[PDB]
Amino acid sequence: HGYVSAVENGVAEGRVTLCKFAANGTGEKNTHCGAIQYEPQSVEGPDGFPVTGPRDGKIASAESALAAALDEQTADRWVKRPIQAGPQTFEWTFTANHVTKDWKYYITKPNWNPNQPLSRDAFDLNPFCVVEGNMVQPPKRVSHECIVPEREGYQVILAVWDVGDTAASFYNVIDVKFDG
Template identity: 55%
Template sequence: MTAGPHQFVWYHTAPHKTTNWRYYITKQNWNPNKPLTRDQFELTPFCTVNGNGQAPAQRQTMNCNVPERTGYQVIYGVWEIADTSNSFYQAIDVDFGNGGNVTPDETPAVVSEWTKTLNGQIAGNNLNAGDKVIARFFDANGEVASMRTELTIASAEQGDANQWSYDLAQQINNAHGDVRVGVKDESGEINPVHGANSVFVKDGSQLKSVAISYEEQQADVSETIAVSNLQYSKIENGNATVTFHVNTHGDVNLEAHVMNHMGAEKGYVKQDMNNANQDVTMNLTDVTAGHHMLKYYATNKDGTMFAQDVLNLMLEEDSASGNTGSYDFTFPQNIGSYKAGTVVLQPKNGKTYQCKPFPYSGYCVQYSPTANQYEPGVGAHWKEAWILKN
């Protein structure tokens, strides 16, 4: 196998409604002589394909960009279904070659500076002239507004999904030097392709994922929808609720998903709303503290999607539930006030940390997205500043 685009095929023996398919790969330096465990795989899937709560075809083919590796590796596929609490798994052995037995006269493999791949891809649907496609980037605290990149479709030809994904990748590369969009070749170069493009960042980048949204021209749609007043509870025993107000004009079908930061679905609702003015509540299960996204879509009775959006929410543990214990702040909120004994919740892992006594407490306030060595539970030297509480 080589790094880059590959097709993965699933043969589904039962038509379960699907949340998503996710693909993980072993770490470059994993030990194949030890029993295979979760710790030997990368934490973040290199590819996630949303199922949108629909039943898949019996034979389902999907395209994913496989990250750069050498030698023997394992790819682990997860089919997460929506209509039961189960998931199905498949593991495949792959060999990238150049597995470490390099003789002195062989040329070592090129090591790219773009070492990390964000969750999500620059890919999507066919669009029409006048539509707009938007790439939105997220770190652990939510969307990074300065990274948002928009492309207005100028023609029917550019509306082809393979064409606009190439054009948008080019535009992102020209506008933002801290990401590189495309497919990585054997020399480590990353260039856009006419198809699904991955987003690469350098080691130390705070970016975690990318998502695509659309603003589509709808000439003959009279229906409207307005979503407002997004509220959400704190997490108790892995459960939470999300509530938002919906106002519709006409006969509208609303479909909404809540996804965690890695793209796993945690809540789903689909509801017909005819001239509605009401609250909608979603129950979330198996959630942990941190950034989540509410993605909603609105279609009319003809099946035309006329509205969609992505709303950010930052879930926190209820201190009374006993999962995290009480804390003073969610890191890095109010960081200038941290002192010895201050307890913070780290939204990236849902754990709480206490600032060490003097003289180490001075490290607790030393943080920026590009210099996070003392960030609790995450930074390279976090133990010099913090004590893990829960």
């Protein structure tokens, strides 16, 4: 159980995180998140993305009933956090810091459709950033350096935390805004 945060040096909070915690600087929160807003750490779903894992249209929720609200996808739906290309630090907070296989970060294709539910077609399915967890428990807050690709405007980053001793993973989409 954990979520992408911006308490120490993280660049951008997860979508689900912003249902509970105000964004740095702007103070913005996501709304109408449903029951997951109580527990943004709980976006757990099937292992094996992208070959298996959550099916198209249920990536953002990870097929969680509590988190079904997160699958909505429009231009106006979610709080966007500024980002730039190049080195950036991603952060996780874990309420339950499970033994970890790895963390993987995926970004939307430039011309992804921000008004359709997320699907594999929307993403570059080759992670732009992979951090190994080595089947040990991480600390309860961690930071990951990632080299982020160029994009213009609104892009989504899918952060996947793969638990090392179970057939589950945690899935946190991040709504980001590049310049342009």
